[PDB]
């Protein structure tokens, strides 16, 4: 299995790593129908989503989507430094696949 | 694919953005039958609810309603500044659709 | 749809409001069979339960009972001031229907 | 319903109260098959488990077992003083039935 | 019924204890399909995973896998010292079976 986010990210089509090394600037979440999602930004303007669960996701990803939103909310509230995001870049905002936190 | 809470809010009828830029002043939650809900207020007095789940909600919203109550509680306890709420204004208190937090 | 805990409480028979304006003094929780419940006290001696889920409860209250126990535990651990409790007074200890927190 | 952990404990055979009045010294948890359990210790060496869910438990206890592990983890991390444990002392280590926390 | 992580770990084949006595240096989590996993590292370079749930896991392990990822995230965020990990050594990175925290 991959040993880090960069190696994990490389296993997928249409992805890239963004290196932030910064805390989350804003956290947004929605319960509106068909927009049950989270959006984060950083002070540099970079904006990312956790996608609404859909047909593009296999069953095993559903629990992981819910965990990711949990992770982003607590990272935001604790001012935890986000190291990198692995994202899909065929979505706008880019869609989070993985997160690493360090320092 | 909203970039932010304002754009997301604008996808729905009967909504508006409240800009608070302040911590939650009070947090109330109920397990009473047919009133399984949360209510928050801000220091100015403004009051908002997370609605009881009902027939106006699609299935995918159910998990998101539970998440929103989780978010409001932890935001309250951590004194996190709420930037904006997207709310449905055809309810009283106005009903929360989305929240943004920023320092 | 109520603006506050006092108005919510008044919608039900066998209820009353306790105004505590104090942090929780003790938090007790049990996983023993037929006593899967929480009990809290305040410095003044006042004691309250979250009831064991039972046939008096409608399905929609089940998730809310679990949320209330979550709320009491974190309120206790963070020393959050409890403003009011709405309780059913036909049980001993009085059974929590709703909580409000404000400083 | 019982008003406190001592009275609750007394409703069950093969139990006792341990009065600790101390924070948890160590927290251990396992996902290994048939040992999906938690173990805590105190500085005096006293050791307790949350048992693996089994046939001795009724269905209503399953959620409560999961909650208890949640409570012990956060008690451990916040250095919350444990007042008492109600345990079954027909198991080694003694098996937790209930916990009380008071400052 | 084990009283500590070392004895628990020894009940299984293909396991070993790693003694860290250090906080987690990095926390990584992925929602990408077939890589719904967590990875942690320590400042000594040591890397561990929580495996993707799979055929090797019995049903009772599923909830425990989810709990372990919750535990690692909060341990990371609170800078809690990890004492030991029990891991399976027939995976790369080694796969977490149990964790102990002390001091």
Swiss-Prot record, chains A, B, C, D, E:
The keyword Membrane applies. Keywords: Disulfide bond, Enterotoxin, Host cell membrane, Host membrane, Membrane, Secreted, Signal, Toxin, Virulence. Its main location: secreted. Transmembrane segments: none annotated. It is found in: Secreted; Host cell membrane. Disulfide bonds join 9-86. Coiled coil: none annotated. The keyword Disulfide bond applies. GO terms for biological process: positive regulation of tyrosine phosphorylation of STAT protein. One of its GO terms (cellular component) is membrane. Changing residue 57 to A: Loss of toxicity. One of its GO terms (molecular function) is galactose binding. The B subunit pentameric ring directs the A subunit to its target by binding to the GM1 gangliosides present on the surface of the intestinal epithelial cells. It can bind five GM1 gangliosides. It has no toxic activity by itself. The holotoxin (choleragen) consists of a pentameric ring of B subunits whose central pore is occupied by the A subunit. The A subunit contains two chains, A1 and A2, linked by a disulfide bridge. This is Cholera enterotoxin subunit B.
